[PDB]
Design brief:
The structure holds 2 chains of a larger assembly.
Chain A: no helix or strand
Chain B: H1 10-26, E1 65-70, E2 73-78, H2 86-95, E3 101-103, H3 107-111, E4 125-127, E5 130-132, E6 136-141, E7 147-157, E8 163-170, H4 181-204, E9 219-221, H5 228-238, H6 248-258, H7 267-278
Parallel strand pairs in B: 2-9, 3-8, 3-9
Antiparallel strand pairs in B: 1-2, 4-5, 5-7, 6-7, 7-8
């Protein structure tokens, strides 16, 4: 869900 | 070279503006023009009556933004979002996997309460179902006293991926003005190194945005998004090593035909582009 964070 | 036996002389310039002006008129928006995106729902779309958004290039149906591509440079130019668009504005930056957002609107402008320019990136907030979060980082000078403040937005919406967005904010660039080529050049170089670092992170993580030509495009906007936005974009274009031989005529024409015939509003702004092109041996005219 926060894959690119 | 075309055939003016003096590429950046006066005659050459006179001719350049001759063709450009003819194009501005041809692109002049008409009432209910089929070429330009119209206002639907009764809501206000354009920030300015005369600064319209092209149809077959608009990012989304409810915003005044365009998918512009000069030569090999792919970016997105828009107007300063109205409060009634901020919710949509954010969803675009997220879906776009924005590697760099550049705001060329003066602090004074965002300040003046009459101008209706929401301070959506220097402070945190909630807009509809989106939950953004601003964070201050670096601060780089660009010469001539002009400075850029950087922030990192974080667009979070339930049921959607959380996107971090690097922001470069130049708050001393007056309205209807044009910073020297020095500043402009230094500015274009910072935006490129910003998007480049971010786009790398996306590739490293295997995002599928690296396979879509409509994503990962630097988003830039000033106030109307046709003057200061154009000068920076024209500089970014030239900052690319793949756009060799692309003339000034091509740069400007493509910008106008992909957004509106106002790109590079003032002449003091075109000149900054002419002087930069003059130091690279880049042609001003075509044929």
């Amino acid at each position: 869900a926060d894959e690119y964070l | 070279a075309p055939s003016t036996v003096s590429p950046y002389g006066p005659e050459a310039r006179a001719e350049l503006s001759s063709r450009l002006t003819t194009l501005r008129n041809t692109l002049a928006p008409a009432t209910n023009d089929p070429r330009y995106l119209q206002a639907c729902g009764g809501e206000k779309l354009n920030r300015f009556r005369d600064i319209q958004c092209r149809r077959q290039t608009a990012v989304r149906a409810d915003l005044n933004a365009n998918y512009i591509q000069v030569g090999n440079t792919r970016t997105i130019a828009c107007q300063y979002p109205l409060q009634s668009q901020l919710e949509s504005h954010f969803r675009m930056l997220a879906e776009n996997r924005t590697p760099v957002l550049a705001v060329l609107a003066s602090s004074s402008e965002i300040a003046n309460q009459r101008f209706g320019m929401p301070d959506y990136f220097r402070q945190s907030g909630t807009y509809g179902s989106i939950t953004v979060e601003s964070k201050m980082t670096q601060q780089v000078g660009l010469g001539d006293g002009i400075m850029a403040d950087m922030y990192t937005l974080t667009i979070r919406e339930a049921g959607q991926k959380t996107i971090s967005v690097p922001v470069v904010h130049v708050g001393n660039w007056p309205d209807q003005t044009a910073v020297s080529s020095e500043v402009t050049k230094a500015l274009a170089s910072l935006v490129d190194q910003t998007a480049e670092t971010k786009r790398n992170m996306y590739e490293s993580k295997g995002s599928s945005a690296v396979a879509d030509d409509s994503k990962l495009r630097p988003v830039i906007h000033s106030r109307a998004g046709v003057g200061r936005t154009a000068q920076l974009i024209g500089a970014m274009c030239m900052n690319d090593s793949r756009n060799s031989q692309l003339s000034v005529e091509d740069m400007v024409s493509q910008m106008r035909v992909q957004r509106n015939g106002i790109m590079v509003q003032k002449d003091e702004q075109l000149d900054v582009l002419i002087k930069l092109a003059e130091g690279q041996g880049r042609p001003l005219l075509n044929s």
